[PDB]
Symmetry: C2
Subunit: 32 residues, 2 copies
Amino acid sequence: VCSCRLVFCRRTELRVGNCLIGGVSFAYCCTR
Amino acid sequence: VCSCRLVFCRRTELRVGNCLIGGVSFAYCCTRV
C-alpha cells in the first residue's frame, strides 16, 4: 500500500516517488 | 483510498493531483472514503 505523506515515509515504507496535490509536494511512500 | 493511475481516474474516483514516479506523471485518483 502507498500513500502521499507531507514529509517522510514510515520506517516500513520506501519513497517510490512524489505527489503534487493542491500546489503542495509530498513523498510518495509504499510498503515493500 | 488513492491510487496512481496512468491517464484516467476510475468513475468512482476524483482526480486530486499527480504522482511523479520514475520520471513519469500519473493522475492521483481518490475515492470519497
